[PDB]
């Protein structure tokens, strides 16, 4: 199981990279237009944020796309992966500007936001290092180093964030939780295929894993922009 | 056409290289001195953002003097290119810390802000990986990529940022407008040069090439920075 | 003199890195329990801030243990050194953060610790250049180079910063001079022991290096935030 080779360079996850590229771009452009005349305040806040979310990514998948936002990463064992790093430069900008989305819906406080950037932040950059780690022992203590992060990153989330946005009105409230409910499964899924695919177990082909992944990045992206863009929680209030 | 081998390593370029950091020094210090003895809060702020832009210039400057910003990316087809990498190292922090401060004498809200310095990023950024793509087909589509986002930075310059500038008193329209102006030509250069410097069709030698993005840069630098805190618009307002 | 090769990977140095590692978590995760039943704002931020200091240094010290974290740099002479350059990566969030508490302890406004963070970050890029230099000419440029932005930093902090925090009450500029000095001695060791160690004139031994590091961090890392943490003065003010 696999996929389309498409720059003949012998990649044939290149095909969901691609789709993954081409969804992202028709996702920033379609925000962008549908936000064009905002003058809310508080929504262009909320679009401006969100608008720039599947434009990186568009960036990073672009990069995968070429071949130039991947590398192969030898093992002690000789074992060759190929490790598209730009996930995480994708990642280290993506995940803070949602979990902006998430703060600013919630009404939290600049430290709490602050710390969850901060704490995402550092689960990416682990998730790097131990995606480009040569030893078993240092790859699996590194997902295990990011996983806690990611701990605290959904606490503070259903708590601090959840209870904040209890207090907001029902409209709210109602966008806050169906998008922490979505952060929170969808989320939880890319520690997962990490473990089981390349990078991890192994379990899981290169091909199946960018089509998950890109499965994953544009429900997270588009979608979740989709249902937060969509909603009346982000015009000021009642 | 080149210049002179500074270093004795091959690299006649290093002749503008030295006088860019010598001359990206001096603007420092010399708005350090200028701007000393200033009190007042908002003057700080455009010195302190202003100095801070030709003091990193200086680092990247210095480090493609001595070799350390210079790096050999070899073509698909064994053609091989000097690229001066730290040029976007520069460009990440200089760009959107000159249009933090169109921004404030513009008096915009921080979402205008942030959307400027997101999508300039996003432009810098790209323009990197095309410099270090290995295909024309990847390297001429970066271009075109962060060329889109150039667009959106000048469009909400001269929308957005314009017309609040235009509500302020005549002496901060005024320095906004002949600074605004200033960046529209001078930036539409760098894209130019790109194209038919030796990262494109390669027209234009690296010798002269590199001399060109010194004058560009040290106008831009120095030239914005002495035209922005000479003027009064930068004390407060009347 | 050296220490032990805790990976059997002729690396002695690693028995400093991995109780280096061991004392930045145990530190993170006090510093954790301790703040989580703080409700004061003004203390969290002081909590949440100091926290992610000993964290990401963790994060920076598991890598060097493991070896991820140290590139091999040829000098011109064909002298090869081994660099540990995840210390700047670190150095890069840490010392801003770090200088964000003394900001904060002061009541400076948001230019004043711009600039500090600014010329700090530019402090640990330009030292993270001469570490990679392969030319003594150049290895020592940036050594000056940064030394220079050093000097404005301490001088910012004993004089803009002093000032300011000389205004609070008894209880404030009491702990903010017994964390500028702490700072003020701690920090210039770091300049010393680079242009002593391998990184310089290296009559230091790597493993002796490490060890010295090691210390400094901990004491600069926990050591500072102990004292701090410990205060009334992050409590409001009287
Ligand atoms: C987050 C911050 C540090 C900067 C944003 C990250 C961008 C720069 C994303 C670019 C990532 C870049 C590394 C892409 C991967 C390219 C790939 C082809 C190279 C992978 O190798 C990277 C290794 C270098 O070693 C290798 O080369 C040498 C020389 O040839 C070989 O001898 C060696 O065997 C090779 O492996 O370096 C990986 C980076 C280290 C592990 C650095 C540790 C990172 C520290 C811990 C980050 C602290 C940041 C913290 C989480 C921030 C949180 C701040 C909050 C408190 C707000
Ligand atoms: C902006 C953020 C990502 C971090 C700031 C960038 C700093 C880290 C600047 C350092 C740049 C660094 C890469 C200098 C160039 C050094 C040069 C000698 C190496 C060039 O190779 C870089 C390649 C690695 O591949 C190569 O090595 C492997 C292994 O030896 C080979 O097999 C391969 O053939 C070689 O080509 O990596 C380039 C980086 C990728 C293309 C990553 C994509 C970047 C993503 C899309 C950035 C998203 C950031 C976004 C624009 C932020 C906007 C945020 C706003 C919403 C606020
Ligand atoms: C601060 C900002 C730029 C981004 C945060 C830095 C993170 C990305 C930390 C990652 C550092 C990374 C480079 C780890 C070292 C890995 C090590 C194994 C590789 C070392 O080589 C790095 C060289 C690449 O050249 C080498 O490879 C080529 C190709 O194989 C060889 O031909 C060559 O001989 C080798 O040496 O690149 C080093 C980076 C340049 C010196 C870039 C200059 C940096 C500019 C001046 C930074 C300006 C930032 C400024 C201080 C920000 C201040 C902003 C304030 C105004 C707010
Ligand atoms: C860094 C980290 C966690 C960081 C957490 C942070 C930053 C949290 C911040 C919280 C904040 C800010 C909260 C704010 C709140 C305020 C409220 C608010 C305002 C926000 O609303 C409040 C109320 C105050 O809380 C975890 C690391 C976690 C790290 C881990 C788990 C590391 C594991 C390592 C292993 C397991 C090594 C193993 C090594 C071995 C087995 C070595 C073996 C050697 C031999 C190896 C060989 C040779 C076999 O290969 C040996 C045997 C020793 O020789
Ligand atoms: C153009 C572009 C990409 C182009 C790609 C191309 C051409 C690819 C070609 C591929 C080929 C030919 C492949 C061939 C294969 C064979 C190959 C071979 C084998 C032969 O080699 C084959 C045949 C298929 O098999 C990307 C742009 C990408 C553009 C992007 C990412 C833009 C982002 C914009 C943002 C982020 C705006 C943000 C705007 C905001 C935040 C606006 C805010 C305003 C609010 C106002 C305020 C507050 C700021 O004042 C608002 C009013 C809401 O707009
Ligand atoms: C020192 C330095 C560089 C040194 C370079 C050297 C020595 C080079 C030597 C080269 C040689 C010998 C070459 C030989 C060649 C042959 C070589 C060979 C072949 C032999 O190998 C040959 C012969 C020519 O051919 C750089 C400093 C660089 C210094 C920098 C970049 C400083 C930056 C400061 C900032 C940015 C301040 C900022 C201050 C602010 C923002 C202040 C704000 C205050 C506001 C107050 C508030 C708000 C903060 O509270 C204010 C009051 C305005 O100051
Ligand atoms: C648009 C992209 C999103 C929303 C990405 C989210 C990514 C995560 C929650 C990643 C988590 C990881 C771990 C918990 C362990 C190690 C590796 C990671 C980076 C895959
Ligand atoms: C001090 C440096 C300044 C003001 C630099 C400005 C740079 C630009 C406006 C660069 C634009 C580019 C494109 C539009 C396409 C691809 C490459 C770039 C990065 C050269
Ligand atoms: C937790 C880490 C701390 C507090 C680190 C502080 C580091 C410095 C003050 C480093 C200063 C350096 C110079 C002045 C010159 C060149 C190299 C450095 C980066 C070691």
């Given at each position: 199981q696999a996929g389309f080779d498409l720059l003949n360079?012998?990649?044939?996850?290149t095909l969901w990279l691609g789709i993954g590229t081409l969804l992202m771009l028709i996702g920033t452009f379609y925000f962008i237009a549908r936000g064009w005349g905002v003058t809310d305040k508080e929504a262009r806040e909320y679009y401006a944020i969100t608008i720039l979310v599947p434009g990186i990514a568009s960036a990073a998948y672009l990069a995968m796309f070429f071949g130039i936002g991947v590398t192969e990463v030898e093992l002690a064992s000789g074992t060759v992966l190929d490790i598209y790093y730009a996930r995480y430069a994708d990642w280290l900008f993506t995940t803070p500007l949602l979990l902006l989305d998430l703060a600013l819906l919630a009404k939290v406080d600049r430290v709490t936001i602050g710390t969850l950037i901060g704490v995402d932040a550092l689960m990416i950059v682990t998730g790097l290092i131990g995606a480009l780690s040569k030893t078993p022992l240092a790859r699996y203590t590194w997902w295990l180093f990011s996983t806690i992060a990611f701990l605290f990153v959904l606490y503070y989330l259903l708590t601090s964030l959840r209870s904040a946005a209890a207090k907001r009105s029902e409209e709210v409230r109602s966008t806050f939780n169906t998008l922490t409910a979505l952060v929170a499964v969808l989320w939880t899924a890319y520690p997962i295929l990490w473990i089981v695919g390349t990078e991890g177990?192994?379990?899981?082909g290169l091909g199946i894993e960018t089509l998950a992944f890109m499965v994953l990045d544009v429900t997270a992206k588009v979608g979740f922009g989709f249902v937060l863009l969509r909603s009346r929680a982000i015009l000021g209030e009642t």
């Open positions: 360079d012998g990649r044939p996850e177990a192994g379990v899981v």
